């Protein structure tokens with residue numbers, strides 16, 4: 001195939017930028033801080049469950065919501081013995097509290113019957129509830145977005161919404177049920193990959209990784225959007241053999257393209273790179289949270305990785321910041337190892353772009369601890385704050401199903417300083433486990 005260059009009018013995680021990361025990540029500015037294992041507790045209210053991917057109830061701008069005097073955190077939880085047991089639980093604390101022990105458990109958001117009662121063809125085939133976001137509406141409602149995963153339909157993933165009805169008293173919160181529970185988006189083929197395209201490849205045994213998940217709600221000027229983990233479609237730079245010849249995915253220069261493309265073509269990562277077409281996608285919603293418009297991706301990762309997770313985006317001090325979590329084990333970049341775990345970050349003057357890499361390369365956070373390390377963390381999430389130059393980084397701590405006595409839990413939070421197009425971890429800024437805000 002002949003070399004070409006096509007950006008599709010979107011931003012790209014380039015091979016050249018990613019290659020700079022192995023050397024750059026040695027700087028403590030970009031490193032998840034060391035945690036103290038003897039301070040680490042299981043979520044007392046979770047009662048023997050693994051609790052991993054979590055997200056706070058947020059105001060439209062991403063700041064932590066105050067629901068009737070409480071903070072609310074939604075989290076994936078399930079049986080450590082069953083990797084396919086994943087449901088969304090709702091945890092809550094009184095505003096002002098910081099202890100991990102302050103987090104009470106309201107239980108599952110959903111009843112098993114809810115997906116059937118929803119009168120929603122896709123939802124009644126759901127087998128697992130995967131990550132998303134939650135916004136606190138202007139009329140005081142808890143508005144959840146999450147991933148409908150269907151194990152029965154070859155791992156179909158559908159962006160889904162529901163309103164969570166919650167009674168509040170001086171002592172407790174209680175989930176009464178849900179309403180407006182509906183599928184929003186399952187891909188369109190042209191802009192974002194759908195499950196049929198995955199099945200076209202031969203699903204799981206093809207080596208392809210189909211994703212359409214981790215939706216993050218955000219507003220700008222009263223317009224409503226979800227930014228989410230996805231993969232490109234046929235019209236915005238699809239996976240395939242031809243993709244390795246697109247200079248937009250390499251960057252730097254034709255000299256670098258020539259050298260890097262030929263190396264990749266001769267490597268054992270050729271097929272992996274061909275299949276890699278991860279994207280951070282965007283859709284606009286209507287005021288009833290239905291689909292208004294499929295939009296172009298904010299960024300894509302063709303050749304680099306098929307998996308850029310937990311999309312997060314917010315405006316802070318005049319600039320827009322876009323983050324994603326990603327595993328080095330799924331990348332094709334020399335120098336990046338199977339131990340390496342990242343939060344990558346991008347910056348723009350506008351929500352819809354264009355986005356340029358945060359610390360020249362995209363590196364914001366690096367974690368490389370052994371999967372066996374009790375203080376291992378993943379799923380790092382930047383929580384925007386009402387004021388100041390710091391965001392709070394949350395993550396989950398222990399690997400799922402690894403230890404009988406130590407479950408996946410809220411990691412100790414820490415501070416990330418953000419100014420202009422640069423970030424640095426704040427020295428000795430470790431907070432409580434699952435702490436959402438600096439202010440108390």
Ligand SMILES: OC[C@H]1O[C@H](OC[C@H]2O[C@H](O[C@]3(CO)O[C@H](CO)[C@@H](O)[C@@H]3O)[C@H](O)[C@@H](O)[C@@H]2O)[C@H](O)[C@@H](O)[C@H]1O
Nearest residue numbers: 053076083086130131147213214307309310327378379
């Ligand atoms: O697709 C095959 C893969 O499926 C399952 O893992 C899916 C996915 O899980 C994690 O992604 C996040 C971030 O932590 O976790 C939830 C799901 O639990 C997702 O909404 C979110 O993106 C991992 O980080 C990913 O690497 C992984 O692909 C299953 O658990 C795997 O064993 C495997 O079968």
Ligand SMILES: [Ca+2]
Nearest residue numbers: 239275277306
């Ligand atoms: Ca792919």
